[PDB]
């Protein structure tokens with residue numbers, strides 16, 4: 020089963036899909052091809068929770084119910100500067116304007 | 124070149140599969156590996172990217188298609204973006 | 211031109227609504243006039259009596275948005291080995307623009323399309339809402 024994801028760090032968002040049976044490490048390889056940082060310099064998160072490399076995406080809570088094309092699940096991403104990992108930190112998207120009176 | 128970068132008006136960088144982006148005639152033309160959108164904010168561009176995924180997944184599919192959701196608060200701007208990007 | 215054929219040969223059909231819309235079935239009569247039929251709630255089915263060569267299409271009952279039936283626009287009942295013909299009614303993959311137009315129309319009264327801060331061509335797109343006539347004067351073209 021395909022799961023549909025947004026991998027997010029700071030102001031970067033990667034839209035991609037993966038198999039529910041694929042691993043967290045395998046997702047880091049995907050990220051490596053795109054952002055050119057190796058898996059050992061990456062941490063992936065679900066919400067505040069650090070994910071283990073060997074776990075499947077399904078075991079980390081990414082399923083067809085929660086990770087749909089039109090509403091993908093978010094995976095947090097943090098890089099290691101050199102010695103230490105940065106704190107997980109996702110800039111929110113912009114706020115929509117107030118509903119015009121005619122729509123309210 | 125598997126991926127392209129779509130940059131919102133507020134600086135958010137959206138990385139999507141090139142073939143997903145190329146479904147917009149406008150984006151194809153702007154590429155022909157990064158595109159800046161001075162008028163499209165991130166809360167609209169994120170949804171645009173979700174639409175790509177939705178379209179590619181459900182086009183020419185015997186499965187039951189779910190509704191593509193749009194919150195009222197983004198509907199106007201998303202409409203303007205969809206008109207511009209032609210889709 | 212687009213009209214049911216008067217075959218008088220019965221054909222049983224299951225209208226199966228696999229969409230989240232309330233569905234309006236429309237039969238094209240022998241003169242090609244659209245006849246509305248009773249609506250189907252989301253996820254419901256009805257076994258109905260129709261005829262071979264009769265023409266149907268399916269709409270959102272509230273908005274007249276176009277729907278698909280077995281992946282196409284028109285459905286024609288065919289010969290039944292005893293069993294009914296399945297008519298699978300689904301949402302199309304709307305363009306993002308059409309989907310946005312749908313949502314804006316559901317929130318804004320037609321009087322006030324003109325008060326929206328948008329280019330003239332988008333007012334025209336809102337006002338030109340889905341309509342069986344235009345679709346028939348198109349399918350028949």
Ligand SMILES: Cc1ncsc1-c1ccc(CNC(=O)[C@@H]2C[C@@H](O)CN2C(=O)CC(C)(C)C)cc1
Pocket residue numbers: 225235237247248249250256258259260261264
């Ligand atoms: C119960 C129901 N719900 C959604 S549609 C529906 C339904 C469907 C069919 C019928 C009875 N069948 C008819 O009216 C058929 C359908 C179409 O082929 C035209 N028709 C006719 O009998 C020809 C006619 C209308 C007598 C000239 C009654 C109700």
